[PDB]
Amino acid sequence: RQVIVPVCMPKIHYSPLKTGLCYDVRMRYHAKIFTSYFEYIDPHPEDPRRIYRIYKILAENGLINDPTLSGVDDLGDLMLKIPVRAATSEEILEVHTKEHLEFIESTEKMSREELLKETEKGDSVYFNNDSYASARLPCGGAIEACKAVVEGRVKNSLAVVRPPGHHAEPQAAGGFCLFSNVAVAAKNILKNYPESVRRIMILDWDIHHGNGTQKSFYQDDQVLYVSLHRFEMGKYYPGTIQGQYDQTGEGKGEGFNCNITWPVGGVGDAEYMWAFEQVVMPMGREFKPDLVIISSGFDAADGDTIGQCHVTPSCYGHMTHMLKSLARGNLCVVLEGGYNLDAIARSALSVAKVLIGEPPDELPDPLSDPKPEVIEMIDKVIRLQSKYWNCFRRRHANSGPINDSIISKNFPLQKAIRQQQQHYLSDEFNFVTLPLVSMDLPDNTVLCTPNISESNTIIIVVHDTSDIWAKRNVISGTIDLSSSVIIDNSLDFIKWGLDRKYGIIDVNIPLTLFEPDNYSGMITSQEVLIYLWDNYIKYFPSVAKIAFIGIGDSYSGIVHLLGHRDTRAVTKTVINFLGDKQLKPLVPLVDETLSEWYFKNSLIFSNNSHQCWKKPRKKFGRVLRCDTDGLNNIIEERFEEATDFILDSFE
Amino acid sequence: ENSLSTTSKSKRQVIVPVCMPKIHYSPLKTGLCYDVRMRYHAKIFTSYFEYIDPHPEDPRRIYRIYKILAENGLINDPTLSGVDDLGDLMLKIPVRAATSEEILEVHTKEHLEFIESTEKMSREELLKETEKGDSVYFNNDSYASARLPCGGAIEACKAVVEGRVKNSLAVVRPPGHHAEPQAAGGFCLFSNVAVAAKNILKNYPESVRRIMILDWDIHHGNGTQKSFYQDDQVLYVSLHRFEMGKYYPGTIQGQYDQTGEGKGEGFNCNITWPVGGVGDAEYMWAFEQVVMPMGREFKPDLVIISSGFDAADGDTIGQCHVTPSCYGHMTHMLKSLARGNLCVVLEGGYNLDAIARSALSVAKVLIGEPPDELPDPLSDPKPEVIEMIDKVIRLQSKYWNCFRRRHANSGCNFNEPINDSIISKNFPLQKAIRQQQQHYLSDEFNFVTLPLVSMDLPDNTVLCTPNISESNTIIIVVHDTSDIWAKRNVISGTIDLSSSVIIDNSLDFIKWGLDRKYGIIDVNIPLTLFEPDNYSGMITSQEVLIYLWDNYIKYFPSVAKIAFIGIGDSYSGIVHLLGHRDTRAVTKTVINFLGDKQLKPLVPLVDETLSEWYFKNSLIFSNNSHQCKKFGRVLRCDTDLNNIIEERFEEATDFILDSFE
Amino acid sequence: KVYYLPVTLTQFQKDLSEILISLHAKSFKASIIPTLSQRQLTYIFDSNIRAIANHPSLLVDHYMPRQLLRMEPTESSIAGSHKFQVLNQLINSICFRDRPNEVIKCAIIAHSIKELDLLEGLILGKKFRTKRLSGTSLYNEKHKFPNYTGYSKDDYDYSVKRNLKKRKINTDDWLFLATTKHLKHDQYLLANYDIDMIISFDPMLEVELPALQVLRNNANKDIPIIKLLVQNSPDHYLLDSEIKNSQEYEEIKSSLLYFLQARNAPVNNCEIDYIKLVKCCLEGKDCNNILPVLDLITSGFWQPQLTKLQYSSTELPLWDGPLDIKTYQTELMHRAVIRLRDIQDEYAKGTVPLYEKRLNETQRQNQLDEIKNSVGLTFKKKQEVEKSINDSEKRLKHAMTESTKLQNKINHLLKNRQELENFNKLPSNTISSENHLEEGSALADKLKEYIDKNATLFNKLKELQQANAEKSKLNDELRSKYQIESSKAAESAQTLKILQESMKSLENEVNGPLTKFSTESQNDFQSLKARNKFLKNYITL
Ligand SMILES: [Zn+2]
Ligand SMILES: [Zn+2]
């Protein structure tokens, strides 16, 4: 009977409430004027229809109770209407100058030809007679949505609003924008509530760059701006030096600006997840904000012909989930861009579902392994941001010019590797040194199987020096050489050829130190191979079915032996694992049926990230494109097909 | 006011008729398992009146947790007894006793017979069976109270899978992650999580085939790992202290390289904190870097959390500093992982206030709140944690795919063991450099080897001039492997052999000493070798130097004027020699090129004038960007590693020659 | 080889059969001792008894809507019948057996399409490769039984062999489904797919069949047959007449009379092991774990009796009158409905004692725990007062030494007074000595105070020790009483759990496919569709 704990009401603040939604049908009249027929077949840079589509996709899923698709007040049970109102001149003058306002006020009252002149002069903008009030409405809408979020009337808010505002600069407008929205809202909050909101975090994931908002808060330390976009300095809009990755603030607000540039288009989900999990979240947790604003934009979704990316609507949900985790829950999503209505509809639906309380769905492919450019880009970004922040020092080994006179006192190491190599070969296969006399070269340049003068089949393996994998100690900086491995790459072919009783000859060819391309190496390769053919191979009595295998470089020697001699009477196959180097061309002198013969019996395996396919001509001989990178991986993958081609070439 | 102002007076037309919202998460409630019969199992106070400090596994735990909920309005049960009409935020799930089939799915019949027989033993029999097992107590009323947790866990997980709740909290005792399939141990009687998981996998093979079990309790989940070792349908991730024999349980099965077996290889993962005292930073780091990519790659259909709050702040058994916001953050991430399915079973916790607050935070996050803020986001995790996490990522890259080409491990294939045979294409680099050095030194000045018989070390470690026992003067270079200067590619890890620049700094001294007709002895202790995984460069160097001083050098007839030169951290091996033996009889000086490494604290064990003699007769060069009496005459060299060697060479050899006179 | 597994009824099927007996007893008694006739009456009697024996959801004269079948868990499905529980145990034993590489195939034979649909709904998601040899399948998957242009103008195409290292191959045992009707209408259905074991869900398969003779001929080893046997039923009698070593109406009547007589048969068996049994069956030996029961020995049974519930007190009208088909349906419907209301009310009244038992348990646990706390505190306080009694003993010793010294000085100075008094010549020694005696008396009073305080402290210690010695006995007594009550508490909890199960069973029966009228008769997802890899964990190819 003893009532130990009397009943009470729950003590929470998040989710007894509803989600604020901001939308109005008066935001659909700022539109272009017809100039040429080309507008009918182009994505229409910023079109009104976007807005209503988003609204409709919500109504069809029950998150809104609206049968006739018009602005009502009884929005159901899961959301809450936030009414809009045109912003006063003071809220606008908080960011812009006083001549911009006069410019738009003049725009309000012009004639038709003057409007055309204005659209033609400006940096990719378009005006219209109804571009004053329809420009004032977004700022007031954003202000009211963020106000509602701060004063605790709702949990988090979403504002379907146009025209966008992350392109307009303080001086003048540019980029189909008229007034900046996010900057105006942030400044009026930070001046209105100096007790609860003292730091704000703006995030931009539209594929263009937000020069306007960045310039607004370039010299301020109360607003942290992070942006992800495509740079491509010359051509991709806006194409200036501000969007570059090295601009990290100026003045009292240094270190409070972050840019993340994709070096090439076509990035998908894995790149964004990697960038968010590696850069945005620790910086956000360290900055410790009190309100997170998102300048959303869906011109990077899968199925867009301007961004040309492949981001699926589940990555948006995952990012929204993390950003909801960041602050105490306050989150306002404003909407800026988009070019293909269906993709932005799906993406907006996903973001709305995650805002209501759902967990995000699963990605369609968790095995993607992002492009090699993005990883180097992210490392370069982490360097500067480690100079300025703290969550990037001591964890990525950063902590905040070799010589040119000591090159004569240098540990060789090349010979070293080969030396080691030779030893074990001998001690298990009894190889023999083959002398290339009248040539000054290291003695162990070519080793052959004992009694090579009696075998029918011969496999000639020409390769450069084997690779090295070096472990980088994580506590402080430099490479640790005492725990490195040597990836021998021409061992499996030797073993496979010795388990089927074939003659084996192995040729090593060094790399020229301090050279971009191993030019002298190619010359040494051609000389050694030509000599080895001229003085030894023509004289073995019992000979048939010779097969070459060139690993990496030093395949130029093989191609030169093919060209400057006639050897198709006995040899039957050439195989070359390029890796990443440039292709070697054939130059025939003896005949051209030799060139066609070379195109027929040949195999060349290259990386996926090679310079080509950005279709090679027949003077290279049937190149093929792997699905992985690196020498080791492509060898371990296509060793089977290579050895099958070899075995099929014989009887 | 405005002019946009749609002025049309007509009735609009329906376009999208009203429908029920197509949402599958939070129109629902959260399940909560609780029953008053679980407070029956208790110890038997036997020795004397130890009532002052009770046993850490206490019934009140459940109560306290429950009570906290009733104080935050999440439950409207006033009398604190399990009722049905909890409230609007939760939904009570009935607890039933588990049958013999479900409990024999993983355990063996002998265990069932043992427990069901101890149900009705005498008093002294219970005392003996308590003192015999490894930290397990039995009591006359222990059968039903042990059958109840498995049934509760199965019922909660079934409610999750069928879709009657969103997630679930199973406030449940006794714990269940230390019981092996054939014997009890560690306050556990029947392994709850394994029984639950196997019954879900058997009775639902159309919505559940892969399950992810995460164990963030600070001890190791022995039983729950052993049950799913040979299985590839259950991925078991665990975070714990290891400490190899001191912490409980202290067995090899908890090491970080027990990465599966059979066809269940790569479906088990341990993350071991080396030293106790971790906090929020280490957990957030290990969760962002390891757990979440592996989870997203595995694609599970159900996520079970074998939670336990004995690592929270203010505790005594765990000794950590985890705060109630870290648990919320981890719960948030794990909610993100699957499509929302989540069961939280309670295992640990032995300080009522900490477990109360932590459980309150976890329940708040489960209900729908977002997590709170961390006390300090500038914490800079300890170095050993970073090194251990890197070592873990290496192995898990050899199995999983999300840990190579993003952490620069796509260069080599770690499935082949780094060896000297022709079985594997991989070979260690140290042996090659040492062989080249041996070749050069031998063919040039007849440098023989010195055998360290009865040790596990490569033969060509110590090289020496011939007839070293008749050399009236000996130089001893305890050097270290060189440092390279090349551009390490960041996608694969392979270095470019055309632009590498390596200098053998430890050779100039060997050349200089030969002209003076002094015997030379070169040592080369590598740095952890990547091969044994327990190698210590400090301990090994210490062993080699104690060996060389006790066995060989201490009996040479014509010995006089032995100097010492040290490069890199290996110089420490020199220090530990002089601080543990009286070596001042023949030794004259000691030189060190410390580079950027920190100083070496010399501590003696025999006398105390050793500190004075070491201060008088030492030279220790150091970096100019270092800024940092018993350390022995630190000098701030001008230039800078190799720079201070090439520049201060003349001063070092001049001082050595002067000291030799 | 033929085999038999004893299977019995469940409480739900027992009650439903009692309802049917109530509806059918009078005309049957009249017989033995377009409305209808006794022929169709006995026919419907036998058919409905068998239908109730096979998962009472078949009692309705309808078909399952073919959508809810793949939308209900295995627990709620097999909670109805016991045959389904036994068959599910058998299938689970055959699927998780210890395997090299064996692709052993099995066949399952039903009697009609209803039971076949129920089976295919039960065994849909499991790890098998199944083929329904009867028309109108349910989610047909296409398991087929056994029996790179790189350049222009070139031709290499190594793609094919490539896929021969990429395609994953199944290793799931084959399992086919069939009905005895379509099995007898046609032939050669089993001689094609070489099978090993047939599980006959029907117990009257008539073992000598053409479509089975061809199989016994073509096969190599001997094939075992497993018939599920109802322990007492109108088919077990005939099946026993076969186990050893016109007229169908009389056999029907004798079977039903035996069923009525043996309705209340006391003894049924248990303890069937499955792993050794499936091993014996697969290897082809005589299995001995199967039980040899084979029969049960022969006014007073014409009265239906349901299961007695605590405070229920209901009755049955026995329907001593004529009938008609629609009247039959409506009568059975309202009888099931009134029994449903009674069992609902029965559940909703046992809630009250559970509440009080829980409350008393909570209060008793809290009392025990408070008692333990008090014990600890009292022992701590006594441990504290120990060192104080020791120091008090020290002070008492000190005071006693002072006492002895003072009395010695008293005796000395008193003897000196005795000297100086006789022939006085009076010095001041007697004055000084008297002063010293006064000092001695003063410090004697002081020591007396101190020894009194010591004795008080000693008595306080002893009293506190007594209190701590009583508290433990109190705790032990409370523990004993707690256990004594805990026994019955657990009993009542288990009983009400079982009652909840039975109530849920009857509710789900009358909720879905339901008797012919609607007189009484999605979120939240109770019908197992929390969709995370359900449709895609169907094979969908
Ligand atoms: Zn854009
Ligand atoms: Zn624990």
CSV table of C-alpha atoms in Angstrom, one decimal, chain A residues 448-583:
chain,number,residue,atom,x,y,z
A,448,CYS,CA,69.2,-19.4,-65.5
A,449,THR,CA,68.2,-22.9,-64.5
A,450,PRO,CA,71.0,-25.5,-64.6
A,451,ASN,CA,71.2,-27.4,-67.9
A,452,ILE,CA,69.2,-24.8,-69.8
A,453,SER,CA,70.8,-26.1,-73.0
A,454,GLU,CA,68.6,-29.2,-73.1
A,455,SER,CA,65.1,-27.9,-72.2
A,456,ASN,CA,62.4,-27.4,-74.9
A,457,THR,CA,60.3,-24.7,-73.3
A,458,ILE,CA,61.8,-21.6,-71.8
A,459,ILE,CA,60.2,-18.8,-69.7
A,460,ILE,CA,62.0,-15.5,-69.6
A,461,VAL,CA,61.0,-13.3,-66.7
A,462,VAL,CA,62.2,-9.7,-67.0
A,463,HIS,CA,61.5,-7.4,-64.0
A,464,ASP,CA,62.6,-4.3,-62.2
A,465,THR,CA,63.5,-4.2,-58.5
A,466,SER,CA,60.8,-5.6,-56.1
A,467,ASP,CA,58.6,-3.2,-54.1
A,468,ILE,CA,58.8,-2.1,-50.5
A,469,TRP,CA,56.0,-1.6,-48.0
A,470,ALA,CA,56.9,0.7,-45.1
A,471,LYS,CA,55.1,1.1,-41.8
A,472,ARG,CA,54.7,4.7,-40.6
A,473,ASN,CA,54.9,4.8,-36.8
A,474,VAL,CA,51.8,6.7,-35.5
A,475,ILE,CA,53.1,8.4,-32.3
A,476,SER,CA,55.4,10.8,-34.1
A,477,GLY,CA,55.8,11.4,-37.8
A,478,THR,CA,58.6,9.6,-39.7
A,479,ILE,CA,58.8,6.2,-41.4
A,480,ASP,CA,60.0,3.2,-39.5
A,481,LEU,CA,62.4,1.2,-41.6
A,482,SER,CA,63.0,-1.6,-39.1
A,483,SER,CA,59.5,-3.1,-39.7
A,484,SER,CA,59.2,-2.9,-43.4
A,485,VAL,CA,58.4,-5.8,-45.9
A,486,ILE,CA,59.6,-6.7,-49.4
A,487,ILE,CA,56.8,-7.6,-51.7
A,488,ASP,CA,58.6,-10.0,-54.1
A,489,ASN,CA,56.4,-10.0,-57.2
A,490,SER,CA,58.1,-12.5,-59.6
A,491,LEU,CA,58.3,-15.6,-57.4
A,492,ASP,CA,54.9,-17.3,-58.2
A,493,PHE,CA,55.7,-17.4,-61.9
A,494,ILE,CA,59.1,-19.0,-61.2
A,495,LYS,CA,57.5,-21.6,-58.9
A,496,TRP,CA,54.7,-22.4,-61.4
A,497,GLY,CA,57.3,-22.8,-64.2
A,498,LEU,CA,59.5,-25.0,-62.2
A,499,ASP,CA,56.7,-27.3,-61.0
A,500,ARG,CA,55.9,-28.2,-64.7
A,501,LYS,CA,59.6,-28.7,-65.8
A,502,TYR,CA,60.2,-25.7,-67.9
A,503,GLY,CA,63.5,-23.9,-68.5
A,504,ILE,CA,63.6,-20.6,-66.5
A,505,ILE,CA,65.7,-17.5,-67.1
A,506,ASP,CA,65.4,-14.4,-64.9
A,507,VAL,CA,66.6,-10.9,-65.7
A,508,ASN,CA,66.8,-8.0,-63.2
A,509,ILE,CA,67.1,-4.4,-64.4
A,510,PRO,CA,67.6,-1.5,-61.9
A,511,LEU,CA,65.9,1.9,-61.5
A,512,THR,CA,67.8,5.1,-62.2
A,513,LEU,CA,68.1,7.2,-59.1
A,514,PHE,CA,66.6,10.7,-59.1
A,515,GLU,CA,64.7,10.5,-62.3
A,516,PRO,CA,60.9,10.9,-63.0
A,517,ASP,CA,61.0,8.3,-65.7
A,518,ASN,CA,63.4,5.4,-65.8
A,519,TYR,CA,64.9,6.4,-69.2
A,520,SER,CA,68.4,5.0,-68.8
A,521,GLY,CA,66.8,1.9,-67.3
A,522,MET,CA,64.9,1.4,-70.6
A,523,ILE,CA,68.1,1.8,-72.5
A,524,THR,CA,69.9,-0.7,-70.3
A,525,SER,CA,66.9,-3.1,-70.7
A,526,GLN,CA,67.0,-3.0,-74.5
A,527,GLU,CA,70.8,-3.5,-74.5
A,528,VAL,CA,70.8,-6.4,-72.1
A,529,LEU,CA,67.9,-8.2,-73.8
A,530,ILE,CA,69.2,-7.7,-77.3
A,531,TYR,CA,72.6,-9.1,-76.2
A,532,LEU,CA,71.1,-12.1,-74.4
A,533,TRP,CA,69.2,-13.0,-77.6
A,534,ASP,CA,72.1,-12.5,-79.9
A,535,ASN,CA,74.8,-14.5,-78.1
A,536,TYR,CA,72.9,-17.3,-76.3
A,537,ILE,CA,69.4,-18.1,-77.6
A,538,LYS,CA,70.1,-18.7,-81.3
A,539,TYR,CA,72.6,-21.5,-80.4
A,540,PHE,CA,70.8,-23.8,-78.0
A,541,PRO,CA,70.1,-26.8,-80.3
A,542,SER,CA,66.8,-28.1,-78.9
A,543,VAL,CA,64.5,-25.1,-78.6
A,544,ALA,CA,60.8,-24.4,-79.1
A,545,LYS,CA,58.0,-22.4,-77.5
A,546,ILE,CA,59.7,-19.5,-75.7
A,547,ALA,CA,57.5,-17.2,-73.6
A,548,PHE,CA,58.3,-13.7,-72.1
A,549,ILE,CA,56.9,-12.1,-69.0
A,550,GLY,CA,57.7,-8.5,-68.3
A,551,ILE,CA,56.8,-7.1,-64.9
A,552,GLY,CA,56.2,-3.3,-64.5
A,553,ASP,CA,58.8,-1.4,-66.6
A,554,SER,CA,61.6,-3.1,-68.7
A,555,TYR,CA,58.9,-4.4,-71.1
A,556,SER,CA,60.3,-1.8,-73.5
A,557,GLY,CA,63.3,-4.2,-73.9
A,558,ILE,CA,60.9,-7.0,-74.9
A,559,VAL,CA,59.1,-4.7,-77.4
A,560,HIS,CA,62.5,-3.7,-78.9
A,561,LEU,CA,63.6,-7.3,-79.2
A,562,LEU,CA,60.3,-8.0,-81.1
A,563,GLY,CA,60.7,-5.0,-83.3
A,564,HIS,CA,64.4,-4.9,-84.3
A,565,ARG,CA,64.7,-8.7,-84.9
A,566,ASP,CA,62.5,-11.5,-86.3
A,567,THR,CA,61.7,-14.0,-83.6
A,568,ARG,CA,58.1,-15.2,-84.2
A,569,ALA,CA,59.5,-18.6,-85.4
A,570,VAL,CA,60.1,-19.8,-81.9
A,571,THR,CA,58.4,-17.4,-79.4
A,572,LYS,CA,54.7,-17.6,-78.8
A,573,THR,CA,53.4,-15.2,-76.1
A,574,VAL,CA,54.2,-11.8,-74.4
A,575,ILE,CA,52.6,-10.8,-71.1
A,576,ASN,CA,53.1,-7.5,-69.3
A,577,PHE,CA,51.8,-6.3,-66.0
A,578,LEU,CA,52.1,-2.6,-66.4
A,579,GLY,CA,50.7,-1.2,-63.2
A,580,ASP,CA,50.6,2.5,-63.6
A,581,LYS,CA,53.5,3.4,-66.0
A,582,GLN,CA,53.1,4.6,-69.5
A,583,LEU,CA,52.4,2.2,-72.4
